[PDB]
Structures are given as structure tokens and as C-alpha cells.
Enzyme design. Structure first.
Site, PDB file in Angstrom:
ATOM      1  N   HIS A  16       3.532   1.414   2.249  1.00 27.22           N
ATOM      2  CA  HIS A  16       4.483   1.911   1.270  1.00 27.22           C
ATOM      3  C   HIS A  16       4.018   3.051   0.387  1.00 27.22           C
ATOM      4  O   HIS A  16       4.876   3.630  -0.292  1.00 27.22           O
ATOM      5  CB  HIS A  16       4.988   0.767   0.377  1.00 27.22           C
ATOM      6  CG  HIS A  16       5.674  -0.318   1.124  1.00 27.22           C
ATOM      7  ND1 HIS A  16       6.807  -0.106   1.871  1.00 27.22           N
ATOM      8  CD2 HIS A  16       5.413  -1.641   1.202  1.00 27.22           C
ATOM      9  CE1 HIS A  16       7.200  -1.252   2.401  1.00 27.22           C
ATOM     10  NE2 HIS A  16       6.372  -2.201   2.009  1.00 27.22           N
ATOM     11  N   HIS A 123       3.901  -6.321  -2.780  1.00 28.42           N
ATOM     12  CA  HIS A 123       5.144  -6.264  -2.031  1.00 28.42           C
ATOM     13  C   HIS A 123       6.065  -5.243  -2.666  1.00 28.42           C
ATOM     14  O   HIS A 123       6.098  -5.085  -3.889  1.00 28.42           O
ATOM     15  CB  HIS A 123       5.927  -7.583  -2.039  1.00 28.42           C
ATOM     16  CG  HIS A 123       5.229  -8.721  -1.363  1.00 28.42           C
ATOM     17  ND1 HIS A 123       5.048  -8.782  -0.001  1.00 28.42           N
ATOM     18  CD2 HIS A 123       4.691  -9.859  -1.863  1.00 28.42           C
ATOM     19  CE1 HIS A 123       4.405  -9.897   0.303  1.00 28.42           C
ATOM     20  NE2 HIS A 123       4.167 -10.566  -0.809  1.00 28.42           N
TER      21      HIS A 123
HETATM   22 CL   LIG Z   1       3.527  -4.500   1.960  1.00 29.31          CL
HETATM   23 CL   LIG Z   2       5.035 -13.837  -0.161  1.00 34.70          CL
HETATM   24 NA    NA Z   3       1.575  -6.692   1.450  1.00 35.70          NA
HETATM   25 NA    NA Z   4       2.603 -13.926   1.345  1.00 34.84          NA
END
Ligand SMILES: [Cl-]
Ligand SMILES: [Cl-]
Ligand code: NA
Ligand code: NA
Ligand SMILES: [Cl-]
Ligand SMILES: [K+]
Ligand code: NA
EC number: 3.1.27.-
Length: 128
Positions: A16, A123
Site C-alpha cells: 500500500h 491494514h
Molecule cells: Cl496490508
Molecule cells: Cl486482522
Molecule cells: Na498487513
Molecule cells: Na491478522
């Protein structure tokens, strides 16, 4: 999931972080070579790592996975949305769509070999 010999934060960067924007077909091979599979969709954030990591210090909000380690970027950033249009690995071909959007990242403390920030992105939870 992430390649098991890497950390989540390292995989987040691989997938990312792209301050220098690239064509999708070229960039996506860096991801897909790890899995030997064509990922269906991927968002590349065109901002420096440190500017993304700074978002981790902002107000914590609930993520889609219902953890409470998500954070909304203070500003929108340029992005590229890469979407698989044909192929099986290694012949993965993508379309690209330019975006300028806020993002929501999840962050956690670093694990062994990660840089020693208090929190690192792990994330890309969503975009806005
Ligand atoms: Cl990621
Ligand atoms: Cl996760
Ligand atoms: Na990750
Ligand atoms: Na995870
Ligand atoms: Cl990790
Ligand atoms: K880890
Ligand atoms: Na894995």
C-alpha cells in the site's frame, strides 16, 4: 493473510505505500510474486510512509473487523485503484483508476524487525 516470514507492517508497506506512483501491471507484481496469484484489487497510497504512520496517532475508531485500532487520515491523498481485468499468475493485467480520498488505517505496535515507531500501519481498512 500475509507472507508468514514477514510482519504485518512490512506487508502493509509492500502492498500500500507508493509515494512514487507506478503503473498497476508493474507494481502489482511486487505483491503477486509473494503469493503466486493475481490479487483482484489493490489500493496504492501515494504518500510517504511517515505521513501514513502519523495517522496512527490520531483518534482511534472502530475498524470493519471491530477492533479499535483504526484511524482516519487528516487529509485526503492521491491513490491508484488497481483492479484485475484478465489473466492467471504471472500474466496478471489490471485497470487503473485515479482517486483522491481519505483513508482509514489500522495500526499496532511494531513486531521484531519493524521500525521502532510506537505504532505502525498494518491494514488499509477502508477509503472515504
Ligand atoms: Cl496490508
Ligand atoms: Cl486482522
Ligand atoms: Na498487513
Ligand atoms: Na491478522
Ligand atoms: Cl505483525
Ligand atoms: K508479526
Ligand atoms: Na500467507
Amino acid at each position: 493473510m500475509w507472507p508468514k516470514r514477514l510482519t504485518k507492517a512490512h506487508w502493509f508497506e509492500i502492498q500500500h505505500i507508493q509515494p512514487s506512483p507506478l503503473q498497476c501491471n508493474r507494481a502489482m507484481s511486487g505483491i503477486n510474486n509473494y503469493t503466486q496469484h493475481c490479487k483482484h484489487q489493490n489500493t496504492f497510497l501515494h504518500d510517504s510512509f511517515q505521513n501514513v504512520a502519523a495517522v496512527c496517532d490520531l483518534l482511534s475508531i472502530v475498524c470493519k473487523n471491530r477492533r479499535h485500532n483504526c484511524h482516519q487520515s487528516s487529509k485526503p491523498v492521491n491513490m491508484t485503484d488497481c483492479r484485475l481485468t484478465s489473466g492467471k499468475y504471472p500474466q496478471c493485467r489490471y485497470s487503473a483508476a485515479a482517486q483522491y480520498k481519505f483513508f482509514i488505517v489500522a495500526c499496532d505496535p511494531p513486531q521484531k524487525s519493524d521500525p521502532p515507531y510506537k505504532l505502525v500501519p498494518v491494514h488499509l481498512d477502508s477509503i472515504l
